[PDB]
């Protein structure tokens, strides 16, 4: 497959043998010239207003413009010090775009967090990455080494007087360091408590000054926009998400992978003119559709275009774009069991309904797996989701836990009912008292 | 709706005919739990109230109960006449099978009710007790 | 000038609708069997002609009575000291009727004149060592020690020393040196006090043996025991 | 376990009793009287008590010459059996570590997990 | 008995000088000393909140806090194989039996030897090419059980 | 500030927030970890209550009190059936893992976490799996702890390291594993520790030296001293 510039604006520079592009390689395939375009002949408003009107949306998984985030940063001149940093974490289950992005196309995200934050002026830059991205790490610390030696970054940044240093902060391991204001936190030496909003970080987010949080995947985006226009962006796709994005297929496919598609393209053709379908001896029951906080759908809803308002009006969304397929030899069941695992060992234990409720899951799923259900465990599995959802906790982590539960008990409840065996227990016999027998 | 409820007893006929005979700014009604319609009337008023409800169409025969209580502590008295203490009159009505609280609301100092003995006889030995435990003085 | 207190609290005629202040709350328990053991029959209620409290629950500790002095709190619902907020006019402020306490003086028209007496810097005297007070909240007050569970929170009486002070005297840290003032010889072990200036040895104040009137007073004979 | 429940439910008032502590950590009454001249035998402390100690036996010959001798001392009431409940261990129930029961080793509870350990 | 040595101490003050504040360098103080003796012990908390002028308690809060900063002792080796639900579909279960087959060790146990430290860990951003594990610094992908124990012979 | 609760009229505080304009009002909303001189942070959630966008509105939406400001013209609901079931939810989350300790608790009848259970409405126990422990610290002679009881409200690390400016006392760990105390066994080094045991909602950190001569707070003689 072809992979022409005009229309994979982040892939078609990747090389075959699966090797990063280093500095004389990329700027030899058109590199930095959306940097040197933005640097020189325009200003920070006028980049920020380029990016606003290109339709470019957050990458991370919620959807939010990146233009108007930008926009909101203060207009006061006293205000000097700005930080950007980068949602390197990526540690949502099913999310591998990220990886691929900077192990072998570091360039790209330092070119991107260059135009970024000449754009927002942002006088300092941090790259938030997992500890569990060694190779993406070397990487990304070699290009900032190449592009500091090459004027690229430091001070006097092509002689504009523009200074900038960016940083790589490699992660200690924990899942919700991906929050933007857990992510702050971490940043500042904390735990990864989030921080309620409002204030946002665009006000006040790193140390106190105004920071600006952006996935790896939209600061990918932003130097093709800088380099090509805006209408060549707009003109990607006709839908409503403009640009690109990397989809793709996982779990016992035939060619489990990533592709760069525009949006609007249907979960079918990234299923099966893509990963090839499912594999030899299984068929297809159910996806979610942006990772493991996402809602699960059918067959039915494979005819969707991957666009966040399709999947929104679905039940579902449209999260990192990384479907993942189940066939029909698994357990609905035992897949909640380790999607709620994950997700109550992965709670920060700041507030309470996250912290003391998924563990409350975990235990009823593990008690319908082994066939020890009692009643009434799948009515309190639905108020668990009822009561988790937006608003109630502090902070998005538990709705996302509690997204793929409530599609499981609404699409697959037959599954749930086979574990309900034991009558309910919880009370034993004490001798010389008559208990109330509840009728 | 269940027994218990908070109710007004607005819908019953002797709250009607109060309104027709006294005027709807002669007294106050009260909702509780108690089931019977709590009437607070004024203290000049009482013994017509008690005439008038002696001659109904069904009358209310009997007085039930007379007592006090004292108001001074009671902090949750909203909806409620101003009143330092308070006498209260449950009289029955065999033939509706109903039954009517009316309140008399007392100052502190002037402690002073028209006697209930010319309608009901009970109500000596009840002003009697009300006067010893409370202090009320019946003319 | 010590005519403000009158008004400090209420006097012992003041009542809330003619009942006293409680001092203990309502399910006040055990009343016929607290003395059981010295006599089946129970005594007498203590009577306060002093104050406006009763030692009884036969009173008034309503959150919306009248009043500033509030032995406790407690209201229906908020058994913790969270009934503290329905004990308030506004929660976090002040108290619903006034805190209690009025101020002895207010503040005068017009102030003092400028203090003259400018004092001469330290010189440490050759023989002489200025006593430096130390004070700490588990110790110094006269009757707080007197408490057995502070012995436990009491420092050691220890005596704090410069290094270069320590150096001249040949001292090391916990070693013990003795000292007599008014003629009265007494041994303590050394700290090494770093931020402590030289010429001065630091006493912890209203300890063991320690009054409070040595600070800024001198010692002699200050050697190692 | 001198939870007090029972002298406060008392509408008589007539128990009275003080906590103290073992070495382990256990509770128990350091003294333990009820005045009989004043008790009711309403049964309200034995349905308040949590840990089916105090108790209300069939037994009614309670006659006495002095008052004073009506007052129960600790060493009058505590008696070498379980009574009418003959299982039931409040301590088994408890979160306190006391002897024998060291933490997580009570009913519905599992072992505690160090916040250093290795396990996410 | 601790006490922090000259590089890492070094490497501690180079991170605190990326940073406004040096509470900042708290997590990569901590990896600092886990990387020069595989795991963070007791005095080692307190000699980075005395480099790093904060509270050991913020220090030790940071340290419980991260699943990657072990507090007790490890292995040699850490393995560590990803439980989550796209490697749970492409069966890591039985990665997980071989591994407790060859090591004869729970999740979270060390071996007899000290040699290997075995450890469920969360997705390793490697689902399209699953199930994986992670030992010390090196990502396995498409695992099977009978390469486990041929992976394993090559971390002596 | 013009609010309106359950459909009656007040005027608050507008640079007030919800919970404490309510609770200024004599109303009764359930919360752990707000305090009126710690401030909000919106940790327990238990402060639930449900605000309408205007007067004619019926859906509404879960909103906290301790982080909403009680502005002009507000309309919130505590006796909503869904905030009253999320608040019975929350205290229910809080009561999977506490030990059954209140006759062995030194809190109890002057407990927080009592009051707010039986004001919620929970008395009925269905859940039916094991409860999470933690071992003790010694921290001192003033006071005792007992971390089975702690509902993870962080009152005690906001008093201590914002407030008071202790250094010693902290929150450690995860998910549904957050020990609050000391990193090490040893004395609570602030002179103003001992407000501890009224900062905390639970039994965790309790007066050792009355714990030593323990009774009931219905059984004290209390007089206003200085
Ligand atoms: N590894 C990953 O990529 C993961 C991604 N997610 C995604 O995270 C999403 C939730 O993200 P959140 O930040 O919690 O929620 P969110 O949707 O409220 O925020 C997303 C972005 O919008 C901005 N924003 C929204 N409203 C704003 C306003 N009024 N003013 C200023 N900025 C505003 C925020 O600053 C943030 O950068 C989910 O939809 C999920 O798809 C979740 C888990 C893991
Ligand atoms: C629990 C949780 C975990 C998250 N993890 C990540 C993450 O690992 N990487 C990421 O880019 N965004 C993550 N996000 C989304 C961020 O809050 C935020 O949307 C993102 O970092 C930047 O927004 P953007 O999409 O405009 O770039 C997470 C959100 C939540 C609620
Ligand atoms: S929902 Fe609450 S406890 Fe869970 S991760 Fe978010 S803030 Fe932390
Ligand atoms: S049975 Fe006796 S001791 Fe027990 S509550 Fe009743 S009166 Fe008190
Ligand atoms: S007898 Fe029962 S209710 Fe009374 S103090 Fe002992 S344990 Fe508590
Ligand atoms: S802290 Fe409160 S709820 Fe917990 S055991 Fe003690 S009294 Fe009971
Ligand atoms: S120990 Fe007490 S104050 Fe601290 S978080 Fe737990 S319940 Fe709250
Ligand atoms: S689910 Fe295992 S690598 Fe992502
Ligand atoms: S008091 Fe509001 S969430 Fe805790
Ligand atoms: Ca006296």
């Given at each position: 497959?072809?992979?022409?510039?005009?229309?994979?604006?982040?892939?078609?520079?990747?090389?075959?043998?699966?090797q990063?592009?280093?500095?004389?390689?990329?700027?030899?395939?058109?590199?930095?010239?959306?940097?040197?375009?933005?640097?020189?002949?325009?200003?920070?408003?006028?980049?920020?207003?380029?990016?606003?009107?290109?339709?470019?949306?957050?990458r991370?998984?919620?959807?939010?413009?990146?233009?108007?985030?930008?926009?909101?940063?203060?207009?006061?001149?006293?205000?000097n010090?700005?930080?950007?940093?980068?949602?390197?974490?990526?540690?949502?289950?099913?999310?591998?775009?990220?990886?691929?992005?900077?192990?072998?196309?570091?360039?790209?995200?330092?070119?991107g967090?260059?135009?970024?934050?000449?754009?927002?002026?942002?006088?300092?830059?941090?790259?938030?990455?997992?500890?569990?991205?060694?190779?993406?790490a070397?990487?990304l610390?070699?290009?900032?080494?190449?592009?500091?030696?090459?004027?690229?970054?430091?001070?006097?940044?092509?002689?504009?007087?523009?200074?900038?240093?960016?940083?790589?902060?490699?992660?200690?391991?924990?899942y919700?360091?991906?929050?933007?204001?857990?992510?702050?936190?971490?940043?500042?030496?904390?735990?990864?408590?989030?921080?309620?909003?409002?204030?946002?970080?665009?006000?006040?987010?790193?140390?106190?000054?105004?920071?600006?949080?952006?996935?790896?995947?939209?600061?990918?985006?932003?130097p093709?926009?800088?380099?090509?226009?805006?209408?060549?962006?707009?003109?990607?796709?006709?839908?409503?998400?403009?640009?690109?994005?990397?989809?793709?297929?996982?779990?016992?496919?035939?060619?489990?992978?990533?592709?760069?598609?525009?949006?609007?393209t249907?979960?079918?053709?990234?299923?099966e003119?893509?990963?090839?379908?499912?594999?030899?001896?299984?068929?297809?029951?159910?996806?979610?559709?942006?990772?493991?906080?996402?809602?699960f759908?059918?067959?039915?809803?494979?005819?969707?275009?991957?666009?966040?308002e399709?999947?929104?009006?679905?039940?579902?969304?449209?999260?990192?774009?990384?479907?993942?397929?189940?066939?029909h030899?698994?357990?609905?069941?035992?897949?909640?069991?380790?999607?709620?695992?994950?997700?109550?060992?992965?709670?920060?234990?700041?507030?309470?309904?996250?912290?003391?409720?998924?563990?409350?899951?975990?235990?009823?799923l593990?008690?319908?797996?082994?066939?020890?259900?009692?009643?009434?465990?799948?009515?309190?599995?639905?108020?668990?989701?009822?009561?988790?959802?937006?608003?109630?906790?502090?902070?998005?982590?538990?709705?996302?836990?509690?997204?793929?539960?409530?599609?499981?008990?609404?699409?697959?409840?037959?599954?749930?009912?086979?574990?309900?065996?034991?009558?309910?227990?919880?009370?034993?016999?004490?001798?010389?008292?008559?208990?109330?027998?509840?009728? | 709706?269940?027994?218990?409820?908070?109710?007004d007893?607005?819908?019953?006929?002797?709250?009607?005919?109060?309104?027709?005979?006294?005027?709807?700014?002669?007294?106050?009604?009260?909702?509780?739990?108690?089931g019977?319609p709590?009437?607070?009337?004024?203290?000049?008023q009482?013994?017509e109230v008690?005439?008038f409800?002696?001659?109904?169409?069904?009358?209310?025969?009997?007085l039930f109960?007379?007592?006090?209580?004292?108001?001074?502590?009671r902090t949750?008295?909203?909806?409620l006449?101003?009143?330092?203490?308070?006498?209260?009159?449950?009289l029955?009505?065999?033939?509706?099978?109903?039954?009517?609280?009316?309140?008399?609301?007392?100052?502190?100092?002037?402690?002073?009710?028209?006697?209930?003995?010319?309608?009901?006889?009970?109500?000596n030995?009840?002003?009697?007790?009300?006067?010893?435990?409370?202090?009320?003085?019946?003319? | 000038?010590?005519?403000?207190?009158?008004?400090?609290?209420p006097?012992?005629?003041?009542?809330?609708?003619?009942?006293?202040?409680?001092?203990?709350?309502?399910?006040?328990?055990?009343?016929?069997?607290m003395?059981?053991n010295?006599?089946?029959?129970?005594?007498?209620?203590?009577?306060?002609?002093?104050?406006?409290?009763?030692?009884?629950?036969?009173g008034?500790?309503?959150?919306?009575?009248?009043?500033?002095?509030?032995?406790?709190?407690?209201?229906p619902?908020?058994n913790?000291?969270?009934?503290?907020?329905?004990?308030?006019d506004?929660?976090?402020?002040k108290?619903?009727?006034?805190?209690?306490?009025?101020?002895?003086?207010?503040?005068?028209?017009?102030?003092?004149?400028?203090?003259?007496?400018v004092?001469?810097?330290?010189?440490?005297?050759?023989?002489?060592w200025?006593?430096?007070?130390?004070?700490?909240?588990?110790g110094?007050?006269?009757?707080?020690?007197?408490?057995?569970?502070?012995?436990?929170?009491?420092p050691?009486?220890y005596?704090?020393?410069?290094?270069?002070?320590?150096?001249?005297?040949?001292?090391?840290?916990?070693?013990?040196?003795?000292?007599?003032y008014?003629?009265?010889?007494?041994?303590?072990?050394?700290?090494?006090?770093?931020?402590?200036?030289?010429?001065?040895?630091?006493?912890?104040?209203?300890?063991?043996?320690?009054?409070?009137?040595?600070?800024?007073?001198?010692?002699?004979?200050?050697?190692?025991? | 376990?001198?939870?007090?429940?029972?002298?406060?439910?008392?509408?008589?008032?007539?128990?009275?009793?003080?906590?103290?502590?073992?070495?382990?950590?256990?509770?128990?009454?350091?003294?333990?009287?009820?005045?009989?001249?004043?008790?009711?035998?309403?049964?309200?402390?034995?349905?308040?008590?949590?840990?089916?100690?105090?108790?209300?036996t069939?037994?009614?010959e309670?006659?006495?010459?002095?008052?004073?001798?009506?007052?129960?001392?600790?060493?009058?009431?505590?008696?070498?059996?379980?009574?009418?409940?003959?299982?039931?261990?409040?301590?088994?129930?408890?979160?306190m570590?006391?002897?024998?029961?060291?933490?997580?080793?009570?009913?519905?509870?599992?072992?505690?997990?160090?916040?250093?350990?290795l396990?996410? | 008995?601790?006490?922090?040595?000259?590089?890492?101490?070094?490497?501690?003050?180079?991170?605190?000088?990326?940073?406004?504040?040096?509470?900042?360098?708290?997590?990569?103080?901590?990896?600092?000393?886990?990387?020069?003796?595989?795991?963070?012990?007791?005095?080692?908390?307190?000699?980075?909140?005395?480099?790093?002028?904060?509270?050991?308690?913020?220090?030790?809060?940071?340290?419980?806090?991260?699943?990657?900063?072990?507090?007790?002792?490890?292995?040699?080796?850490?393995?560590?194989?990803?439980?989550?639900?796209?490697?749970?579909?492409?069966?890591?279960?039985?990665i997980?039996?071989?591994?407790?087959?060859?090591?004869?060790?729970?999740?979270?146990?060390?071996?007899?030897?000290?040699?290997?430290?075995?450890?469920?860990?969360?997705?390793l951003?490697?689902?399209?090419?699953?199930?994986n594990?992670?030992?010390?610094?090196?990502?396995?992908?498409?695992?099977?059980?009978?390469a486990?124990?041929?992976?394993?012979?090559?971390?002596? | 500030?013009?609010?309106?609760?359950?459909?009656?009229?007040?005027?608050?505080?507008?640079?007030?927030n919800?919970?404490?304009a309510?609770?200024?009002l004599?109303?009764?909303?359930?919360?752990?970890?707000?305090?009126?001189?710690?401030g909000?942070?919106?940790?327990?959630?238990?402060?639930?209550?449900?605000?309408?966008?205007?007067?004619?509105?019926?859906?509404?939406?879960?909103?906290?009190?301790?982080?909403?400001?009680?502005?002009?013209?507000?309309?919130?609901?505590?006796?909503?059936?869904?905030?009253?079931?999320?608040?019975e939810?929350?205290?229910?989350?809080?009561?999977?893992?506490?030990?059954?300790?209140?006759?062995?608790?030194?809190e109890?009848?002057?407990?927080?976490?009592?009051?707010?259970?039986?004001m919620?409405g929970?008395?009925?126990?269905?859940?039916?799996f094991?409860k999470?422990?933690?071992?003790?610290?010694?921290?001192?002679?003033?006071?005792?702890?007992e971390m089975?009881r702690?509902?993870?409200?962080?009152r005690?690390?906001?008093?201590?390291?914002?407030?008071?400016?202790g250094?010693?006392?902290?929150?450690?760990?995860?998910?549904?594993?957050?020990?609050?105390?000391?990193?090490?066994?040893?004395?609570?080094?602030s002179?103003?520790?001992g407000?501890?045991?009224?900062?905390?909602?639970?039994?965790?950190?309790?007066?050792?030296?009355?714990?030593?001569?323990?009774?009931?707070?219905?059984?004290?003689?209390?007089?206003?001293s200085?």
């Open positions: 497959i072809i992979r022409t510039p005009e229309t994979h604006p982040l892939t078609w520079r990747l090389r075959d043998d699966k990063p592009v280093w500095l004389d390689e990329y700027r030899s395939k058109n590199g930095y010239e959306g940097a040197r375009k933005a640097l020189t002949g325009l200003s920070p408003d006028e980049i920020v207003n380029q990016v606003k009107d290109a339709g470019l949306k957050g991370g998984g919620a959807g939010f413009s990146t233009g108007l985030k930008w926009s909101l940063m203060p207009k006061d001149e006293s205000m010090i700005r930080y950007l940093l980068c949602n390197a974490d990526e540690m949502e289950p099913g999310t591998y775009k990220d990886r691929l992005l900077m192990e072998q196309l570091p360039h790209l995200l330092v070119e967090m260059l135009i970024s934050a000449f754009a927002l002026k942002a006088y300092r830059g941090y790259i938030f990455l997992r500890g569990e991205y060694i190779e993406a070397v990487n610390r070699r290009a900032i080494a190449e592009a500091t030696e090459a004027g690229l970054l430091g001070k006097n940044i092509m002689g504009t007087g523009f200074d900038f240093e960016l940083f790589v902060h490699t992660g200690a391991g924990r919700i360091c991906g929050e933007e204001t857990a992510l702050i936190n971490s940043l500042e030496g904390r735990r990864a408590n989030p921080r309620s909003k409002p204030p946002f970080p665009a006000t006040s987010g790193a140390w106190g000054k105004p920071t600006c949080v952006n996935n790896v995947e939209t600061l990918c985006n932003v093709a926009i800088l380099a090509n226009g805006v209408e060549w962006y707009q003109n990607i796709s006709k839908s409503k998400d403009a640009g690109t994005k990397l989809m793709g297929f996982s779990g016992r496919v035939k060619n489990p992978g990533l592709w760069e598609l525009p949006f609007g249907t979960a079918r053709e990234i299923l003119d893509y990963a090839g379908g499912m594999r030899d001896g299984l068929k297809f029951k159910a996806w979610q559709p942006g990772g493991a906080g996402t809602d759908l059918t067959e039915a809803h494979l005819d969707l275009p991957m666009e966040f399709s999947i929104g009006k679905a039940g579902s969304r449209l999260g990192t774009a990384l479907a993942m397929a189940v066939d030899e698994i357990n609905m069941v035992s897949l909640v069991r380790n999607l709620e695992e994950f997700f109550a060992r992965e709670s920060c234990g700041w507030c309470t309904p996250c912290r003391d409720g998924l563990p409350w899951s975990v235990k009823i593990r008690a319908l797996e082994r066939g020890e259900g009692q009643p009434g465990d799948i009515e309190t599995l639905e108020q668990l989701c009822r009561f988790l959802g937006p608003g109630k906790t502090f902070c998005a982590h538990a709705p996302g836990a509690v997204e793929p539960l409530q599609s499981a008990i609404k699409y697959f409840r037959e599954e749930f009912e086979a574990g309900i065996k034991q009558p309910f227990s919880n009370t034993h016999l004490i001798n010389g008292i008559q208990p109330n027998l509840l009728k | 709706e269940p027994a218990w409820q908070t109710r007893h607005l819908d019953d006929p002797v709250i009607g005919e109060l309104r027709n005979r006294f005027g709807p700014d002669a007294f106050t009604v009260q909702a509780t739990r108690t019977v709590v009437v607070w009337i004024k203290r000049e009482l013994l008690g005439d409800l002696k001659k109904l169409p069904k009358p209310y025969v009997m109960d007379l007592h006090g209580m004292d108001e001074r502590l949750h008295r909203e909806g006449p101003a009143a330092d203490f308070s006498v209260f009159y449950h029955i009505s065999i033939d509706r099978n109903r039954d009517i609280m009316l309140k008399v609301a007392l100052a502190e100092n002037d402690l002073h009710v028209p006697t209930f003995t010319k309608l009901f006889p009970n109500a030995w009840y002003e009697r007790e009300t006067w010893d435990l409370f202090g009320i003085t019946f003319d | 000038e010590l005519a403000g207190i009158k008004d400090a609290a006097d012992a005629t003041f009542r809330i609708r003619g009942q006293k202040l409680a001092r203990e709350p309502h399910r006040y328990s055990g009343r016929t069997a003395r059981a010295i006599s089946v029959h129970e005594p007498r209620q203590p009577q306060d002609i002093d104050t406006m409290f009763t030692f009884s629950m036969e008034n500790n309503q959150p919306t009575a009248h009043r500033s002095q509030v032995p406790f709190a407690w209201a619902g908020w913790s000291p969270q009934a503290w907020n329905k004990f308030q506004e929660v976090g402020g108290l619903r009727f006034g805190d209690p306490g009025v101020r002895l003086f207010e503040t005068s028209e017009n102030g003092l004149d400028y203090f003259t007496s004092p001469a810097r330290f010189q440490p005297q050759d023989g002489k200025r006593i430096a007070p130390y004070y700490h909240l588990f110094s007050d006269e009757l707080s020690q007197r408490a057995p569970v502070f012995q436990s929170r009491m050691q009486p005596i704090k020393l410069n290094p270069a002070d320590a150096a001249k005297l040949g001292v090391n840290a916990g070693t013990r040196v003795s000292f007599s008014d003629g009265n010889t007494v041994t303590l072990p050394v700290e090494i006090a770093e931020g402590l200036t030289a010429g001065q040895v630091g006493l912890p104040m209203g300890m063991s043996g320690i009054a409070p009137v040595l600070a800024g007073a001198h010692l002699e004979d200050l050697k190692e025991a | 376990v001198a939870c007090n429940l029972c002298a406060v439910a008392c509408p008589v008032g007539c128990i009275s009793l003080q906590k103290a502590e073992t070495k382990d950590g256990r509770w128990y009454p350091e003294f333990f009287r009820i005045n009989f001249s004043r008790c009711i035998f309403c049964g309200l402390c034995e349905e308040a008590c949590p840990t089916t100690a105090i108790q209300l069939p037994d009614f309670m006659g006495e010459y002095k008052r004073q001798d009506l007052v129960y001392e600790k060493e009058d009431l505590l008696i070498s059996g379980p009574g009418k409940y003959p299982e039931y261990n409040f301590y088994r129930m408890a979160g570590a006391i002897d024998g029961k060291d933490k997580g080793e009570a009913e519905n509870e599992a072992k505690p997990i160090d916040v250093k350990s396990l996410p | 008995a601790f006490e922090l040595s000259a590089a890492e101490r070094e490497a501690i003050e180079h991170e605190m000088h990326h940073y406004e504040d040096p509470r900042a360098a708290s997590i990569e103080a901590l990896k600092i000393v886990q990387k020069q003796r595989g795991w963070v012990p007791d005095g080692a908390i307190h000699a980075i909140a005395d480099v790093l002028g904060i509270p050991a308690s913020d220090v030790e809060g940071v340290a419980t806090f991260y699943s990657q900063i072990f507090r007790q002792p490890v292995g040699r080796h850490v393995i560590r194989y990803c439980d989550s639900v796209v490697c749970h579909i492409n069966g890591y279960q039985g997980q039996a071989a591994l407790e087959k060859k090591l004869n060790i729970k999740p979270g146990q060390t071996t007899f030897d000290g040699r290997f430290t075995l450890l469920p860990t969360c997705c951003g490697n689902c399209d090419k699953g199930p594990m992670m030992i010390d610094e090196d990502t396995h992908a498409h695992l099977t059980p009978e486990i124990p041929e992976l394993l012979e090559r971390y002596k | 500030a013009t609010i309106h609760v359950d459909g009656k009229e007040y005027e608050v505080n507008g640079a007030d919800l919970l404490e309510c609770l200024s004599g109303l009764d909303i359930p919360y752990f970890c707000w305090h009126p001189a710690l909000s942070v919106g940790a327990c959630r238990q402060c639930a209550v449900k605000q309408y966008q205007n007067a004619e509105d019926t859906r509404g939406r879960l909103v906290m009190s301790c982080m909403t400001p009680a502005s002009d013209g507000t309309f919130i609901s505590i006796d909503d059936e869904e905030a009253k079931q999320f608040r939810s929350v205290v229910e989350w809080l009561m999977t893992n506490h030990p059954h300790d209140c006759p062995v608790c030194e109890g009848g002057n407990c927080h976490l009592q009051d707010m259970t039986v919620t929970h008395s009925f126990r269905r859940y039916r094991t999470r422990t933690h071992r003790n610290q010694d921290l001192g002679p003033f006071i005792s702890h089975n702690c509902i993870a409200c962080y005690c690390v906001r008093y201590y390291k914002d407030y008071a400016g250094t010693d006392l902290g929150v450690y760990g995860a998910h549904d594993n957050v020990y609050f105390g000391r990193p090490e066994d040893g004395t609570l080094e002179e103003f520790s407000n501890l045991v009224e900062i905390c909602p639970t039994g965790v950190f309790t007066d050792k030296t009355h714990s030593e001569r323990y009774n009931r707070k219905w059984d004290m003689q209390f007089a206003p200085i």
